[PDB]
Design a protein around this ligand. Structure first.
Ligand SMILES: Cc1ncc(COP(=O)(O)O)c(CNc2cccc(C(=O)O)c2)c1O
Ligand SMILES: Cc1ncc(COP(=O)(O)O)c(CNc2cccc(C(=O)O)c2)c1O
Ligand SMILES: [Ca+2]
Ligand SMILES: [Ca+2]
Ligand SMILES: [Cl-]
Lengths: 454, 455
């Protein structure tokens, strides 16, 4: 088992340092039940990230497995290319019903990067069809991750993910994120900080020329950097800026949609209506690949006239089996009231994690719904962060291994500053939150002993 | 007649000019200059309040520069500096290197400023390839700044109206705020804090794009477009520190500011910073023969001067013998007449003379440095309320532009940023020149205020 090398010899894992497995076993997950996963040695771990911000309803759902086999037996695949099949139609209508405003057109994909590509392409062709052909640029936030195909990667704001692959698609420009914990200005004033951070988008539009800007892409709660919720008033101001300058607002809800924040579409949690939503991940609780770009009827109008066509598509978009699974997943959400469960429990989950503020290594606890980041520090009074050496030895060398070994699968990361991130299945309850807090308390107390002076 | 003459409209495509203006009206035609004055084709005289186009530092009608040109043209008017030298280019390269700060000792001649900007960005890209940092290619510059029109320099230009018809341009250019403290969103009442903030926006953009991907920052010493923004105290020192920290090259774009405009040969010395490269053109010859240069640190030249490496870049007419001889003769005027020190000795009274216009209601700001000033016009100075688009069209372009010229002052009236009148007269200007400028502006700006409110 330990000397088995099948994965190292053939499976090129995603965003993974493969040399780690030349002489050591690859951690292999074989089974899930509810909020737990099991490895190939029969060890059990709490699935603190719902796989990869995906498994909303929990593992082991026979209802979803049976929905897949029932549809696969009848019609597993037919393309939605000048043809429809019933489950894609039903799901498009259902998503349209749930989406706000006139977001009534559903362009299905398999993944979230594919949906982000769809949104930027749609914006470009929309502006060509409506006589504004210079509109093509896109604005997004520093540190944000929007996916990996080269268009989406241009919108991604993590230079380490981009430098080996440049040049990418022209036209992407970055603005500050809303990390109030480290705000250079207005850190003590959320409303003023929100207005400032939104106005940075207006400034970038002005710097590049509004007639050349097509769209702004924003996650409702920013993932990379550690769960930055939107300041009060932020999205309202962004919506106003986008309206003023004729720029489209894309709510990138690949993590946030499907109940992560307690609503089907996360824009509704914050009271804004975007022009498009990108989504994927939790639409099926991950049980079968599918996602979508959901699009305002205003944007669809020119494409629905005469001999015009949105020249875009994916073989597997709107897949019958995935569509059937998605509908079965939304049926679970409705019958079990998962969205309201998250709204009803977000306050106690946050409060439970905030108990960790009595530990010296904990600098911040932040997030919304069932999505939280805990930022680690050398000194909470000055917010002194880890050195690079401390990040390598303590965050990755010690903490990441110790969390898993103590029974908690979650994310330890330093895309921004050192953070532990949590996004468990939406069936999690107080017992789950207590289990998480207890393992974090053990391991974070141990981690503090490995920091020098601190 | 002259008035019905359409030769220019029919054949001369003027630069940045709305040509339909001349379908049915004559083109203003300048035929002669003397000192700080120019004369049109009817013999009317105007004060050359822009030195042509921020160029004619020594004044018009310099026989010494005319004779320098003919003397060189008779002996050798052209031979390329391509694997060959000719004496006047060598002598001028040595002279400019002597005047430039630090180890800025290598002179890559061009004919214009845009050509020099292109040189600087290309040199930065190849330098980082030769030194094993191949991902470094991006460039940072300021909103509203004008860095020229070839498509690489145009990417560095920060005026979207100049760029949108021509995109996509060269990838890699990113913008940061300019240092217009008059309209600063933050720190408007604190120059030092504003300077630190504005410099730190450069660090932020480097971090946003990834420092290993960023090659250079391009900054004018005093920003022209937007109306003569001088650097806040401490700004360039902080920029230099950021560039050092992130291994990014600093390019001082001195196409306007060099050759005495701010009282020094190289304008980076006015503000006490040493860039990695200087771009320059314009005043090198007082405009009497086209030439410019990118002047480059020996640190940057080092890899290119080793073995079989070549900076694969050039221009036929760069380092032109006649232009080089004229530049040397122009620098001789500067030395004998002490033009640099004259500007330093007169900049305070020029500024204070223009500041007399602050008692006019239409005047919101007077700003600049050396012999380079902007006067910003406003609807309400207490609130800094700017002109509406309609007010700009009627008062700035409809009335002011014409009235300035007709009252004897050639200068720039512009709204690339907000509505400003800019001044950059020849360096031989003195208090009499400044008084003349102030008097014509007072007349026309009093009239402009009345027109602003006659709607
Ligand atoms: C906001 C956002 N947009 C686009 C994507 C791309 O989705 P696909 O992967 O389906 O193409 C994402 C994906 N988000 C994601 C994926 C993998 C890891 C992590 C992490 O932060 O650890 C985050 C995302 O979070
Ligand atoms: C800072 C700067 N950089 C580059 C150039 C390009 O130089 P060439 O023109 O020689 O290619 C300039 C030129 N600057 C310039 C040229 C023409 C008009 C105006 C105006 O502001 O009215 C300014 C300049 O000011
Ligand atoms: Ca809808
Ligand atoms: Ca030198
Ligand atoms: Cl240790």
């Amino acid at each position: 088992k330990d000397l088995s090398r099948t994965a190292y010899d053939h499976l090129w894992m995603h965003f993974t340092r493969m040399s780690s497995y030349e002489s050591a076993p690859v951690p292999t997950i074989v089974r899930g039940e509810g909020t737990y996963i099991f490895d190939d040695q029969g060890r059990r771990y709490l699935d603190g990230l719902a796989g990869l911000f995906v498994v909303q309803a929990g593992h082991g759902r026979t209802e979803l497995a049976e929905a897949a086999s029932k549809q696969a037996q009848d019609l597993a695949f037919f393309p939605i290319w000048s043809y429809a099949h019933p489950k894609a139609v039903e799901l498009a209508e259902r998503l349209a019903h749930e989406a706000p405003g006139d977001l009534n057109k559903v362009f299905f994909t398999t993944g979230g990067g594919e949906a982000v590509e769809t949104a930027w392409k749609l914006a470009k062709q929309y502006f060509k069809l409506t006589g504004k052909p210079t509109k093509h640029k896109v604005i997004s936030r520093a540190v944000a991750y929007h996916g990996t195909p080269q268009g989406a990667l241009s919108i991604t704001g993590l230079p380490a993910l981009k430098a080996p692959f440049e040049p990418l698609v022209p036209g992407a420009h970055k603005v500050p994120n809303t990390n109030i914990y480290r705000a250079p200005l207005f850190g003590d004033d959320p409303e003023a900080f929100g207005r400032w951070a939104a106005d940075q988008i207006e400034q970038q539009i002005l710097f590049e020329g509004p007639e050349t800007v097509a769209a702004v892409f924003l996650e409702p709660v920013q993932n990379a950097g550690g769960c930055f919720p939107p300041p009060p008033g932020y999205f309202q101001r962004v919506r106003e800026i986008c309206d003023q300058y004729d720029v489209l607002l894309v709510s990138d809800e690949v993590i946030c949609a499907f109940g992560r924040l307690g609503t089907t579409f996360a824009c509704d949690k914050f009271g804004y209506v975007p022009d498009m939503i990108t989504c994927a991940k939790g639409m099926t609780s991950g049980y079968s690949p599918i996602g979508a770009c959901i699009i305002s009827d205003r944007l669809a109008e020119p494409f629905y006239q005469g001999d015009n066509t949105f020249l875009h598509g994916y073989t597997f978009g709107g897949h019958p089996v995935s569509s059937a699974v998605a509908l079965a997943n939304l049926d679970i959400f409705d019958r079990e009231g998962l969205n309201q469960h998250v709204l009803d429990n977000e306050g106690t989950f946050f409060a439970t994690l905030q108990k960790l503020h009595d530990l010296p290594i904990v600098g911040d606890v932040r997030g919304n719904g069932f999505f939280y980041g805990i930022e680690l520090v050398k000194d909470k009074a000055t917010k002194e962060t880890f050195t690079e050496e401390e990040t390598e030895r303590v965050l990755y060398g010690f903490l990441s291994k110790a969390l898993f070994d103590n029974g908690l699968y979650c994310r330890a990361d330093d895309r921004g500053d050192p953070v532990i991130q949590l996004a468990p299945p939406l069936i999690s309850d107080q017992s789950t939150f207590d289990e998480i807090e207890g393992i974090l308390r053990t391991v974070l107390t141990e981690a503090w002993t490995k920091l020098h002076h601190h």
